[PDB]
Amino acid sequence: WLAFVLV
Amino acid sequence: MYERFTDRARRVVVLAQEEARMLNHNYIGTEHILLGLIHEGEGVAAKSLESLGISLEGVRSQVEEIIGQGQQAPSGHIPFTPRAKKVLELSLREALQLGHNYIGTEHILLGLIREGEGVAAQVLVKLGAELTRVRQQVIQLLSGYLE
């Protein structure tokens, strides 16, 4: 969260 | 905040990345979230879009017309666009206001229409689904689930 899957 | 997403909503986000990858795209945009919502095929968002005549093929054709594919499929993590980030932020608020502590597929769809400006929104309008109509359809289906 919130740039990539799943960050 | 992904901890609050339902299993199916997480699957939509995971699938959105692969929708981008297989189109040789290097960002996950709102249109890939739209494709993922439809392609996962089970949740309230998929049902809502099917019930408005928005098909995976209709969306794919519009994405090819508006964006087009790259030359090579990327490896590794594909970043969200600014508008896709906004969609996922807004999803949290849609869920809270509808009385949910989890974020389901419907809330991602509602976030997408709330953002209302990126490629997915352009596609929906082009396919005949005005944003207010999409929202009201989601509400209509959710109301049927209260029976």
From Swiss-Prot, chain B:
Phenotype on disruption:
Depletion experiments (using anti-sense RNA) stops degradation of anti-sigma-E factor RseA.
Positions of the UniProt region annotated as Repeat 2: 80-144
- Can you tell me where the transmembrane regions are? none
Q: Which residues form the Clp R domain?
A: 2-144
Superkingdom of the source species: Bacteria
Which stretches does the entry tag as region Repeat 1? 5-70
Q: Which family does it belong to?
A: Belongs to the ClpA/ClpB family. ClpC subfamily.
Job description of the protein? ATP-dependent specificity component of the Clp protease. It directs the protease to specific substrates. Can perform chaperone functions in the absence of ClpP. Degrades anti-sigma-E factor RseA in the presence of ClpP2.
Write down what this protein is called.
Answer: ATP-dependent Clp protease ATP-binding subunit ClpC1
- Species of origin reads Mycobacterium tuberculosis (strain ATCC 25618 / H37Rv)
Q: Which residues of the full protein are shown?
A: 1 to 145 of 848
